[PDB]
Ligand binder design. Structure first.
Ligand SMILES: NC(=[NH2+])c1ccc2[nH]c(-c3ncccc3[O-])nc2c1
Ligand SMILES: [Ca+2]
Ligand SMILES: [Cl-]
Length: 223
C-alpha cells in the first residue's frame, strides 16, 4: 500500500496473509473455512495466516491453517486478468472471535464515488520496494467507468473497476494482490493489477466481486 497508514492491530479482522515461507498475497475470510483471493496468487504450498498484524513476529491471535484446496475461476485469463478470483478452502475451520472475523459478500454492486478500505502488506514505495511488517490501510473511492476505461483503454472488462486517485501517490501495489476492497461492510473488490503503483492517471484495477456472488455460493455449496 503506497500513501496509506498503519491500520492498527486486528482492526481489519477478515484480512489474511497467504504464506509459502514468506507473505506473497492477501485474501479475505468470508466464512470459517473459506477465503477469497485473486487467481493470479495461485500456487501450491499455501498456508493461510489469520489474525496477523506484524507478519514477521508471533504476537498472539494468529491462526496458521493450511489450504486443503484452491479453486481458480475456470474462465480466469492470465493475459487479461479477466475473472481474477480464487477461493481457498481451509484444512480446518478457523476460530472466529473479534480479531478474526469474516466479511460479508455484497447483494448489490457499489457505485462510483463509494469510499472503500483497501489493506495489505504489499510494497509501500511507487519507485522501489519497501515491504512493511504491519498491516497498512488506504481509504480510496471507486472511480466512474468512463475514467477507468479512459485510463486503461481496451483493458477493462465488466468484471473490473478502478479505485484510487488519478493525482497519484496513494494506491495498492505488489504484495497487496488478492486482498480486500471493503465498502460499507461488504467485500466489493479484490486487489488485481495496475500500471506501476501510485502513478498519476493509472489507478488500481480490482476484480468486481458483485459479479461472482452466485459463483462463490454455488462453488462453496458443492465443495
Ligand atoms: N498499482 C496497483 N494497484 C497494483 C495492485 C496490485 C498489483 N499487483 C501487482 C503485481 N506485480 C507483480 C507481480 C504480481 C503482482 O500481483 N502489481 C500490482 C499493482
Ligand atoms: Ca504476527
Ligand atoms: Cl474501451
Amino acid at each position: 500500500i503506497v500513501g496509506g497508514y498503519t491500520c492498527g492491530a486486528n482492526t481489519v479482522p477478515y484480512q489474511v496473509s497467504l504464506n509459502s515461507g514468506y507473505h506473497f498475497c492477501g485474501g479475505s475470510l468470508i466464512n470459517s473455512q473459506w477465503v477469497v483471493s485473486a487467481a493470479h496468487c495461485y500456487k501450491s504450498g499455501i498456508q493461510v495466516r489469520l489474525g496477523e498484524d506484524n507478519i514477521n513476529v508471533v504476537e498472539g491471535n494468529e491462526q496458521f491453517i493450511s489450504a486443503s484446496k484452491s479453486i481458480v475461476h475456470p474462465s480466469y485469463n492470465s493475459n487479461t486478468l479477466n475473472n481474477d478470483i480464487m477461493l481457498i478452502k481451509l484444512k480446518s475451520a478457523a476460530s472466529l472471535n473479534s480479531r478474526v472475523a469474516s466479511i460479508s459478500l455484497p447483494t448489490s454492486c457499489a457505485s462510483a464515488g463509494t469510499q472503500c478500505l483497501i489493506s495489505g502488506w504489499g510494497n509501500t514505495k511507487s519507485s522501489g520496494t519497501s515491504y512493511p511488517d504491519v498491516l497498512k490501510c488506504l481509504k480510496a473511492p471507486i472511480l466512474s467507468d468512463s475514467s477507468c476505461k479512459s485510463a486503461y483503454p481496451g483493458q477493462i472488462t465488466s468484471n473490473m473497476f478502478c479505485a484510487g486517485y488519478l493525482e497519484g501517490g496513494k494506491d495498492s501495489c505488489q504484495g497487496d494482490s488478492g486482498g480486500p476492497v471493503v465498502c460499507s461492510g461488504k467485500l466489493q473488490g479484490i486487489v488485481s493489477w495496475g500500471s506501476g503503483c501510485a502513478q498519476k492517471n493509472k489507478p488500481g484495477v480490482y476484480t468486481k466481486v458483485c459479479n461472482y456472488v452466485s459463483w462463490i455460493k454455488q462453488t462453496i455449496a458443492s465443495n
